[PDB]
Design a protein around this ligand. Structure first.
Ligand SMILES: [Zn+2]
Ligand SMILES: [Zn+2]
Ligand SMILES: [Zn+2]
Length: 798
RNA sequence: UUUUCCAAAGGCUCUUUUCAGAGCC
């Protein structure tokens, strides 16, 4: 009848050792698996981002708080139990750093036997008894989708029952993304709510980030560089500290008068470096002398989303914002093909750049003859050289300035270096936040060029005065602003090629300009409005470069992802009916590694531009299961564990295996910078960092030199030897986003010399693509398990 | 078997002096 005080929100099962109370949500939940693959309590914890667990009053342990004996951390995802060697008393300790920093140092305690408290997405039976299957089915049954809906209702209001899910029927679902449109106003009305939802979600998830009572080195700078170094106390474990964001520094202490300054991040965590560094744009009134009792806060900004909305409305209301043909093509309207009447250069090669192959030459000649061209660039095909050829030819056409944009600043830097290699005059536009960022192409930045602009000397005098003092008078500031605007306008008109980011093209300084040529790059990594921001500038000839098989843009809002916002402009153009021209040759992999992904994801179209003897590293005496094939799959029988964040995964057994193979690789003579570690899960990456940094069997700096990153963090990077840990291994659950073929594509194509795959074939074989992976690897007879020294071919079949 | 937990990004505002003016980073 009436639910007791300790009753599950989802089902209401009442039992002493079956209900767990959450301090964050002030609700009880059952440990029963239910219809879904996960327990109710674990599902509530992961969905509601809670990290506090309170045991029921009656049970094997009674009213207990699961706190680490060393540090007392509340986050249950880090605690683990150790059975005593003398009695049955269990020791609850954090995985790290409490394993080595434990004050108890009990003889019966050992950290090797340590296991996570959460297993198979549910609490262990001895702690919380799993409800009996018959009782857990005879009671009220709730499915996953309505569970998520009820959790959302609880989040938006802490009063919601089962009847609140059906009787109201809120709906208000965002309009789904269409493939074919009819009006620009329709496009704006459809994509406005999605952008607004994304911005709101980002603001909500990023505004709740602050720290208090931190130290600061507080070093100074000659040219007004208030540079502050401080380290996050790692209690919040927030990685949102990023280049270009805004940080407000508040000094509420009594040592100095209260100060509230604004600055930008200049240095994020690095290899063994940490000590995040920020640059303050405020005056000299900052409390330099004080170090402690410093408060910091991150405030979200809406510049990017405002730029997307402005571009959308400009496209909706301005007929000349884009060419008519491009406007009709983007809306899916069926129109006849148009051939651009451009003069074809006799030689397709670029001065100062390597000669293109036949496929690249054909791609260039086809692109130059079409107002709209789509290029599918497989990994390792030298797409940068191709794009350099395109910009070279476009500038040689003399049809005004040529705009280049890319979602990532690294891609922009690579492309601008490539074009500058031809000797062409290029101007790189950087944001104010990125002005202090040091880059190899920073000498080509707009602000640095202005600082080196010697035709007008009073501008330099004002600049150095600003560098040596604070803000000048109002008239002086107005004159300086006018001089800067005039100089940058002259530079931009004089410049032949302007390169920046896709969002950065929305800068007012770049505004009020018309460009007849745009070569949006890496578009497969950007949301459709992000790619659409630069084109409303007056595009007439428009080129996309990217690979849908590589990866897609990352969207955080669940509703936006469901509505189709994750789709890139490249994908929509491809599915519209435009066949993208794809480069057929590449020089990045030894043929053995490149044979499989070409066969699978590129229907056997890629060609190996390098030979086997070319892609062998000298002084590398490492044994292989097949001497001709420098890759293999190592089989591990580990169990996945929930990461500290509560939504990622890790595995200790695979981490130890990775450590062993990396130690062997360094013993083989491979340079430490060549060894890369790739994991799709952030929690696994952090655990590997902790395991390889603090506990180093070999030289600690030796392990330090290698670097670990997420899939798309490493995607823009190319190295010799790569070792992958797929992490996920669950009998009753899925692999997660590992079923996405794009991540498999980038993971297999990230190498140059060798790939070492580590994972559990039994769990991965359920997904058909990974089953094909396993079948191919067994056909090559490189599935190996057991001792590293004594390699044995696995007998498992899939 | 849910949908997955994964990067990158990045200064303007106010006022009817609005054909404009004012102030901030
Ligand atoms: Zn329940
Ligand atoms: Zn909760
Ligand atoms: Zn602890």
């Amino acid at each position: 009848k009436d639910l007791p005080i300790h009753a599950c929100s989802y089902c209401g099962i009442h039992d002493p050792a079956c209900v767990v109370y959450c301090n964050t949500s002030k609700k009880w939940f059952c440990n029963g698996r239910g219809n879904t693959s996960g327990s109710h309590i674990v599902n509530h914890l992961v969905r509601a981002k809670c990290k506090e667990v309170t045991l029921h009053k009656d049970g094997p342990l009674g009213e207990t708080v699961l706190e680490c004996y060393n540090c007392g951390c509340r986050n249950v995802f880090l605690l683990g139990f150790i059975p005593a060697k003398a009695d049955s008393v269990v020791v609850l300790l954090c995985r790290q750093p409490c394993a080595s920093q434990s004050s108890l140092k009990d003889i019966n305690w050992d950290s090797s036997q340590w296991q996570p408290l959460i297993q198979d997405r549910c609490f262990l039976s001895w702690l919380v008894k799993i409800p009996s299957e018959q009782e857990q089915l005879r009671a009220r049954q709730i499915t996953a989708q309505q569970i998520n809906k009820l959790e959302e209702l609880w989040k938006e209001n802490p009063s919601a029952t089962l009847e609140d899910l059906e009787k109201p029927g809120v709906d208000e679902e965002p309009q789904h993304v269409l493939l074919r449109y009819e009006d620009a106003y329709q496009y704006q009305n459809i994509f406005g709510p999605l952008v607004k939802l994304e911005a709101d979600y980002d603001k909500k998830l990023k505004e709740s980030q602050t720290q208090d009572n931190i130290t600061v080195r507080w070093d100074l700078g000659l040219n007004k560089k208030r540079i502050a170094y401080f380290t996050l106390p790692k209690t919040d474990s927030d990685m949102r500290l990023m280049q270009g964001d805004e940080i407000c520094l508040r000094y509420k202490g009594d040592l100095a008068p209260l100060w509230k300054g604004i600055g930008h991040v200049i240095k994020v965590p690095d290899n063994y470096g940490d000590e995040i560094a920020i640059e303050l744009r405020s005056s000299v009134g900052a409390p330099v002398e004080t170090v402690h009792n410093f408060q910091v806060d991150f405030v979200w900004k809406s510049t990017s989303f405002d730029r997307m909305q402005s571009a959308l409305k400009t496209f909706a209301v301005d007929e000349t914002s884009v060419s008519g043909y491009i406007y009709h093509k983007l809306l899916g309207h069926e129109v006849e093909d148009v051939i651009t009447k451009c003069q074809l250069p006799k030689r397709f090669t670029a001065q100062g750049l390597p000669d293109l192959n036949h496929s690249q030459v054909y791609a260039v000649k086809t692109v130059l003859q079409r107002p709209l061209s789509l290029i599918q660039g497989p990994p390792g095909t030298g797409k940068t050289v191709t794009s350099a050829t395109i910009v070279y030819h476009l500038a040689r056409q003399g049809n005004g300035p040529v705009l280049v944009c890319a979602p990532s600043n690294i891609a922009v830097d690579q492309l601008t270096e490539k074009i500058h290699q031809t000797g062409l005059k290029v101007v790189r536009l950087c944001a104010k936040s990125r002005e202090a960022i040091d880059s190899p192409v920073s000498f080509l930045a707009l602000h640095n060029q202005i600082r080196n602009m010697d035709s007008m000397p009073e501008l330099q005098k004002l600049q150095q005065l600003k560098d040596e003092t604070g803000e000048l008078s109002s008239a002086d500031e107005k004159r300086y602003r006018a001089l800067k605007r005039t100089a940058e306008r002259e530079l931009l008109m004089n410049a032949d090629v302007i390169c920046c980011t896709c969002v950065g093209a929305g800068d007012p300084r770049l505004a009020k300009m018309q460009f007849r040529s745009i070569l949006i790059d890496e578009s497969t990594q950007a949301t459709e409005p992000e790619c659409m921001v630069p084109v409303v500038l007056g595009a007439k000839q428009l080129i996309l470069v990217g690979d849908h098989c590589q990866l897609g843009p990352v969207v955080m809002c669940k509703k936006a992802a469901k509505a189709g916002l994750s789709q890139s402009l490249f994908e929509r153009l491809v599915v519209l009916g435009i066949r993208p021209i794809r480069l057929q040759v590449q020089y990045r992999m030894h043929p053995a590694l490149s044979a499989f992904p070409s066969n699978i994801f590129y229907e056997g179209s890629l060609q190996n531009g390098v030979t086997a003897a070319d892609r062998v590293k000298k002084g590398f005496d490492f044994q292989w299961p097949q001497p001709d094939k420098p890759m293999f799959f190592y089989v591990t029988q580990g169990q996945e564990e929930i990461a500290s964040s509560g939504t990622s995964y890790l595995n200790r057994t695979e981490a130890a295996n990775v450590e062993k193979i990396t130690t062997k690789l360094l013993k083989a003579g491979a340079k430490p910078d060549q060894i890369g570690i790739i994991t799709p899960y952030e929690g696994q990456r952090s655990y590997l960092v902790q395991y390889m940094q603090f506990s180093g069997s070999l030289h600690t700096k030796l392990y330090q030199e290698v670097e670990i990153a997420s899939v798309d963090a490493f995607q823009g990077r190319e190295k010799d030897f790569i070792i992958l840990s797929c992490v996920r291994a669950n009998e009753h659950q899925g692999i997660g986003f590992l079923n996405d073929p794009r991540r498999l594509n980038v993971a297999l194509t990230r190498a140059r010399y060798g790939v070492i795959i580590v994972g559990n074939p039994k769990a991965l074989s359920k997904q058909p693509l990974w089953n094909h992976l396993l079948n191919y690897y067994k056909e090559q007879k490189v599935l190996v398990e057991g001792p590293l020294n004594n390699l044995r071919e696995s007998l498992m079949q899939f």
